[PDB]
Design a protein around this ligand. Structure first.
Ligand SMILES: NC(=O)c1ccc[n+]([C@@H]2O[C@H](COP(=O)([O-])OP(=O)(O)OC[C@H]3O[C@@H](n4cnc5c(N)ncnc54)[C@H](O)[C@@H]3O)[C@@H](O)[C@H]2O)c1
Ligand SMILES: NC(=O)c1ccc[n+]([C@@H]2O[C@H](COP(=O)([O-])OP(=O)(O)OC[C@H]3O[C@@H](n4cnc5c(N)ncnc54)[C@H](O)[C@@H]3O)[C@@H](O)[C@H]2O)c1
Lengths: 244, 247, 244, 247
């Protein structure tokens, strides 16, 4: 009888997270931009026996986010688990980055999750239990031709750790799962062998890999794990300075 | 899960290592109890089998290569494979820099750093043949640096570098190599303290509470799981947030 | 390596940076919001013999920033060195964080330095020489009651490293100096005595400490040091996970 | 600056250590040339004295505690103080995990990690007396993990933990403890290689160029400077960006 909100549930990673938590008896709320995709996902999850609601939203403004949050809490009466799946961001060389490219990356990549945390974290501290899992990716560490993505994702590192310390005393944990290279079935086969060669386990990651890590951090027993940046990357994070 | 995986846990005759073995066995694993204290091995082996667990005692100094090879051979004779290795055996000689004997350094390095290297080396070939392995090393928040802990911080920091190196090297063979860095954990020492000390340390814990041995066992269960094959090269703190700022 | 722009030069750290760089013969451009303070600083530096110009600007919008940069390039014909000193940000507990507190922190703490980097990095890569030094502080790692500051500062980590890699081939380096606790002579002696105790070297940092590290990264000979997060903290950064 | 400071650079009779000693002497420091190679010690001491530098040869295996103490005694008898210690002496035996001999491990650990511990210990009491010290340890990008480099990655990662621990402990005595992690550096090995070797590694460099020993010497001059007393506990990469992604 635990309740979880999955933001940006409308992709393969969101689907896998929803399936892992449903498997553990968690009551689900799915937020996302593609209502069509959300309804189909909820339909499949309900079909398997999960308690689930959907909420369409392509928002980055705080008020709209706080409302979405209100819908969920109206239905379930509390949010024990918040999983923020990242929204797609386009990485481009510096010259191709416009004034609006900067603002948009920050809005969806950093501001939007911040707003979700502000709308949910206070409730969790009041109830004395909370599990926040931010899903980021390796570009937060900074790579060539990703500056606009890296600036936004990198903000979640200090953000998550700040609120982890602020909420620790009230039974809340805030952690980050950092995705490596995940297969998607739209990448060219030549880019699968190319990417896999550069990964120590010599295979691309799956959405299930990510959900397994999210499910661990969201588990009731992970009460002493907080502030963590857990890479699910096949070892590729070992090539970066400052990933530990 | 880890049903019917074989797990060798170094230094598991008492303390957190002991409790990780119990939880591993409860989740369906065959566990090798190792320690240098042969009486604690026997008592714990006795305890575990009594509970119905598939368990083998293997007394060996993890700092000695021949003793490690004999441990692994005994494990292979018994269970035929080693799916999981937890390098939990450790110790510390501490003190101000000028007060550290050459032996204070040599032993802390030998048990924590070399010992973890010896067991990982001796076991990994078996995981290579089985195209499956989980290697988890127990480091410490003190790898980030601790006053009066030059040898322990050096040794455990070395374990972190080994974790990263072997995560890169062994990945192609289906072996993951990860590290757990425990913060402050309720230990028998903890009860050996006066309230005035205790309440100072807790107050430096963001949660205000102590970690328990189960906190490590559960994190270790996650890293060892069949489902966690894509997690490798990681340093995961089990510290209640103290690792975020330990000042 | 003769021309340097110091953004937010109108504080004690900016002054110290200006003195160190002028001491090495660098021609200076000082940007900041307080024209009064900026002019007094330029006056003092000229009085000692330094080549200096001032540019008043309290801007965080990209277009205005590009203008500021053009003024400098009009006067000197090139920017060899960019030092972005951080602007003050209000750290506050999550409940006291408003919707606009979030946007402002990102705009002044993260978007603004990004815009400066976008305006200067292309020039540096074209000239084949560049030294970018971002000045941040320990709140980027995340502490209780700093979430809006941590989110903004933390974005500079990936941003600097992304552009470090993107520009490396063209003689440009991008590094970060992270300030610990700096004495200010408006801090109470009681908060100095408390703060110093928590620092391994048992003293507060000075603006000169910060400028010394900035000067090292900006030197012509630091051509093989890039992407670095250099703490100038008296050792306090050793208490944080993920600072190395 | 470092005018009138006394600097001990271990393993400085050849390679970048020598180039660090030269630049230190040129910036006003008295330098102790150390190596295990006594003939390389004499040749460099001779070379430096001819250049007008204040230099002393101190032959010692920095991995041997007795030899280290004699080096520190020779330095103190000669110059009366030790202001700067650069733990540059290092080495590596590498190979697949299964092919690493116990001796390949023991020596890499002994020279890089214990040696750095022995020299830092033997020197620090003198810096405490003077309420001023600069300790800079030479680690490597490989502390982040390198396939086939289990011993080297372990040792240099251990040096990172030692740097952090001692920065915390020794700071109150006016001693800073920092670490430089060189990436790829133009070396005599490099000049003695065939072309195809060279062209792969360069291709992995963000700058497209190799770092030079002066890059290390200049970075070390900064950390050792009288003005850098508030810099401590740091790991500063001299890699040309390679450390940001080495895959
Ligand atoms: N709160 C904590 O206790 C804490 C905190 C941080 C890290 N750690 C680390 O976690 C691990 C377990 O913690 P612990 O408190 O139970 O330590 P512990 O010393 O109480 O138990 C470790 C066991 O390993 C045995 N052992 C087996 N082979 C050995 C060998 N060659 N040399 C020496 N001992 C050998 C020891 O006899 C001992 O019983 C250690 O590595 C420790 O460094 C513990
Ligand atoms: N590209 C690189 O060369 C590179 C990269 C990363 C790290 N490093 C590290 O930089 C340091 C020096 O670099 P290097 O290229 O000159 O390596 P190197 O093989 O030339 O060793 C430097 C000196 O140390 C001496 N030495 C070895 N063992 C000694 C001992 N026990 N006692 C005293 N002296 C000893 C050697 O005589 C040698 O002259 C090493 O620590 C190395 O690990 C080098």
């Amino acid at each position: 009888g635990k309740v979880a909100l999955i933001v940006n549930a409308d992709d393969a990673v969101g689907e896998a997270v929803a399936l892992r938590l449903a498997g553990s008896g968690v009551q689900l709320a799915l937020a996302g931009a593609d209502a069509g995709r959300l309804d189909k996902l909820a339909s499949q999850l309900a079909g398997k026996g999960a308690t689930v609601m959907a909420v369409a939203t392509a928002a980055v403004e705080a008020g709209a986010i706080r409302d979405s949050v209100a819908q969920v809490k109206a239905r379930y009466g509390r949010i024990d688990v918040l999983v923020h799946n990242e929204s797609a961001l386009a990485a481009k060389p510096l010259p191709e980055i416009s004034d609006a490219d900067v603002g948009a990356a920050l809005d969806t990549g950093l501001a939007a999750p911040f707003h979700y945390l502000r709308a949910v974290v206070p409730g969790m501290r009041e109830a004395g239990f909370g599990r926040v899992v931010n899903i980021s990716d390796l570009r937060y560490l900074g790579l060539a031709n990703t500056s606009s993505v890296a600036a936004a994702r990198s903000g979640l590192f200090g953000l998550t750790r700040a609120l982890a310390l602020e909420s620790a005393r009230d039974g809340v944990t805030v952690n980050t799962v950092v995705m490596g290279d995940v297969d998607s079935e739209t990448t060219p086969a030549a880019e699968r062998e190319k990417l896999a060669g550069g990964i120590p386990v010599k295979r691309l990651g799956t959405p299930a890999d990510i959900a397994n890590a999210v499910g661990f951090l969201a588990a009731d027993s992970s009460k002493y794990v907080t502030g963590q940046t857990l890479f699910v990357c096949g070892g590729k994070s070992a090539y970066f300075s400052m990933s530990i | 899960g880890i049903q019917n995986r074989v797990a060798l846990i170094t230094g598991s005759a008492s303390g957190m290592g002991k409790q990780t073995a119990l939880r591993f066995a409860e989740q369906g694993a065959a566990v090798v109890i190792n320690d240098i204290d042969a009486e604690k091995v026997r008592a714990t082996v006795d305890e575990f089998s009594a509970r119905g667990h598939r368990v083998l005692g293997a007394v060996a100094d993890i700092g000695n290569k021949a003793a490690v090879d004999g441990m692994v051979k005994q494990t292979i004779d018994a269970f035929g494979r080693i799916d999981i290795l937890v390098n939990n055996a450790g110790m510390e000689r501490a003190g101000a820099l000028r007060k550290l004997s050459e032996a204070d350094w040599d032993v802390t390095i030998n048990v924590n750093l070399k010992g973890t290297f010896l067991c990982t080396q001796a076991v990994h070939g078996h995981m290579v043949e089985n195209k499956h392995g989980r290697i988890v090393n127990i480091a410490s928040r003190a790898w980030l640096g601790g006053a009066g802990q030059t040898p322990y911080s050096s040794a455990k920091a070395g374990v972190v570098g080994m974790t990263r190196a072997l995560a890169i090297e062994l990945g192609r063979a289906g072996i993951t190599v990860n590290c757990v860095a425990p913060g402050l954990i309720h230990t028998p020492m903890w009860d050996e303290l006066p309230e005035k000390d205790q309440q100072f340390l807790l107050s430096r814990q963001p949660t205000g509470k102590l970690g328990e041995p189960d906190d490590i066992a559960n994190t270790l269960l996650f890293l060892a799981d069949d489902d966690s094959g894509f997690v490798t090269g990681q340093v995961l703190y089990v510290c209640g947030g103290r690792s975020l700022f330990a000042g």
